């Protein structure tokens, strides 16, 4: 009593009932499996972003004032 041994006959059909969906792409994928030495350093960089805040805020206010002067000169 020998069987059928293997096949792939009805399988494509079976797969395509429910699509063959592409793998759901997000923005902001994880940093799992990224070269450790990198990840330390981007972690440290992220740690000290709040250091150098007061400088950054002022720079944007100076930029915003320069934009407001430019738009007044245009109008």
């Amino acid at each position: 009593a020998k069987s059928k041994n293997h096949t792939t006959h009805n399988q494509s059909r079976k797969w395509h009932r429910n699509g063959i969906k592409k793998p759901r792409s997000q923005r902001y994928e994880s940093l799992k499996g990224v070269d450790p030495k990198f990840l330390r350093n981007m972690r440290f960089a992220k740690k000290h972003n709040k250091k150098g805040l007061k400088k950054m805020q002022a720079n944007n206010a100076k930029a915003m004032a320069a934009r407001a002067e430019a738009i007044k000169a245009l109008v």
Binding site: Q11, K14, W15, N18, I20, K21, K22, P23, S25, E29, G33, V34, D35
Partner: protein, 159 residues
């Protein structure tokens, strides 16, 4: 039932082409992949360290990691019913920049040129592409000489 061995059936795939054996010429090594570079994988026989598996040869995907002398590269591999985006660590020698994306960037650059200009002019320009339309109305001058008649030729047995 076939053997599950890693390199089964790559007699031809991983085999340097005709009269291109020997030293892996150096541009190959010394060109830079960043994150998110579109990259097509193509295994190579000379370099056996960091070889991709025979399933990812031909396949294109994006770079996610870059180590000292290899590049982590997300590629989509189908499995019966489900496409699995998965991340593989190929050594540079088995990898090129895929040009597929550059022709796109060329077009967007050309669009940004054609958007900046034609704004002060006022005349809006076709930025979208369009498929090859039917080939328009036109005259054909049979200049002096008439058409050439083509009789089909009588059969004969050559061999």
């Amino acid at each position: 039932t076939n053997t599950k061995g890693k390199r089964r059936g790559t007699r031809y795939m991983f085999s340097r082409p005709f009269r291109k054996h020997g030293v892996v010429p150096l541009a190959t090594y010394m060109r830079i992949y960043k994150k998110g570079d579109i990259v097509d994988i193509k295994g190579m026989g000379t370099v056996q360290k960091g070889m991709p598996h025979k399933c990812y040869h031909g396949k294109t995907g994006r770079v996610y990691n870059v180590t000292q002398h290899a590049v982590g590269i997300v590629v989509n591999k189908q499995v019966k019913g489900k496409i699995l985006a998965k991340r593989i660590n190929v050594r540079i020698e088995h990898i090129k920049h895929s040009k597929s994306r550059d022709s796109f960037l060329k077009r967007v650059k050309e669009n940004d040129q054609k958007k900046k200009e034609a704004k002060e002019k006022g005349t809006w320009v076709q930025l979208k592409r369009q498929p090859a339309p039917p080939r328009e109305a036109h005259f054909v001058r049979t200049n002096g000489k008439e058409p050439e008649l083509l009789e089909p030729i009588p059969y004969e047995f050559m061999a």
